[model samples]
Target: LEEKIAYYKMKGHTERGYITIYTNLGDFEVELYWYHSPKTCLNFYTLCEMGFYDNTIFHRVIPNFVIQGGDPTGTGKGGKSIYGEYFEDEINKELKHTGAGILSMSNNGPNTNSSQFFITLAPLPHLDGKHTIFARVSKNMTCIENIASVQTTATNKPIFDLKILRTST
Candidate 1:
């Protein structure tokens, strides 16, 4: 495990990979924590490469919480990892939902991570052990903040159809 971590840590940003999420509102880049969450990073990276997140909407949004997406159904109930319908969490002690723009998996329960993901709009300490934070927004956080403030339904679904136009690695 140490060797694997070192290998990924030494790789260039392009080699380890970063994802750029283009939304109708704007675009943001996320730097994947390959050494911290290899499996989760691989799953997310492969899915983006497959164009699996294209046209997906941010189904859940809360003003002071998070803005979630990667669910193709736009219902907050659909999406699957590249591995399958679900995968185990990749929790790292070093990774934390310390502040806004932290990218994490949206799971129904323990080890149920799939395609759905959420970006924190504020620091979330309670989520430290439960969610797998595989990446962090590296640029254009304003885009995320704007999405979080968009009009939403009572259930927190964005009323304006904030969608991910595409993703590029």
Candidate 2:
């Protein structure tokens, strides 16, 4: 798998794809690491192209941790990949969760990644090999900080309804 990633990179697939996520709080750009995680990136890119993430709320938030969303049901328990209800985990060990703005697939356990994803608000080395880190925030980091600091219930659901207005590539 590492060779496959390197092969793609060597073949000029190193050009990063861009996705702009517009939310009620603000907008931020994400740089997709396709060379590192092609399948995972494609899944997210296709979902965005289909407008599947429109008006979706950031259902989960944890200050100095991560903010999660992409569940159409707004319940944190809903959402599926463009491929199906779930997809395999694309763990790239080279991609470490070393800092904030890291984007990764949120899943139940292993190989259960779907549409739910999260953005880290701080370094989380413990999650380095557990989740599929496919992208990272490229601009407007403050917007992510704003969403991360919002009030939430005991269950971690944000109270202000911070919504993703749209996601575009």
Candidate 3:
């Protein structure tokens, strides 16, 4: 879980980055936001470069809150931020926290999150700073919603399988 993931944003290739994010619930089409946090964007970039998330799954899902994955262990706590990760500043405020397909980073505090990522099932702004958004959904949001419509246990763990299709710079 201590693997370094490179973000397309960090690679300075933020024109468009795609991630086929998989979870126990289902797979999602993600378009990361590289402009806000370049380091995170590049962290994923390195992961894709090393093929670290080829078989990972989203371990946590919130029916009306969020869906999280990117953990190879699926233990709800996985991933290692890149070595000497920088960008210790607040991101742009113009970003939108839209429902379905909103890609974000999960952090217990600032500059601490490594690979824990999530997608919003609903518009939850309380996660503004706690999570850094790196992508937005341009399509297939209905499919994302359908996946979120599944039955989940109180622990918020999906009782199914998810497979990431692919990730590209």
* Leading candidate by TM-score: 1
How far is each candidate from the true structure, as Cα RMSD in Å? 2.6, 3.2, 4.5
* Model 2 lDDT tens row, 7-73: 5444423444788999999999998888778778877877888899999998989998899988999
Clashing pairs in 2: none
Per-residue lDDT tens digits for candidate 3, residues 43-121, read: 7656766777777766766877887877777787667756553334335687656565777877667767677777787
Worst 10 residues of 1 by lDDT: 1-10
Tens-place lDDT per residue, model 1, 97-160, is: 9999999999999999999999999999999999999899999999998898789889998888
Q: How many residue pairs clash in each candidate?
A: 0, 0, 21
Quickly count the clashes in candidate 3.
21
Instruction: Evaluate model 1: give its TM-score.
Output: 0.92
TM-score for each candidate, following the candidate numbering:
0.92, 0.90, 0.77
Per-residue error (Å), model 1, residue 169: 2.5
lDDT of each: 0.87, 0.87, 0.65
Give the distance in Å from residue 128's predicted Cα in candidate 3 to where it truly belongs: 1.6
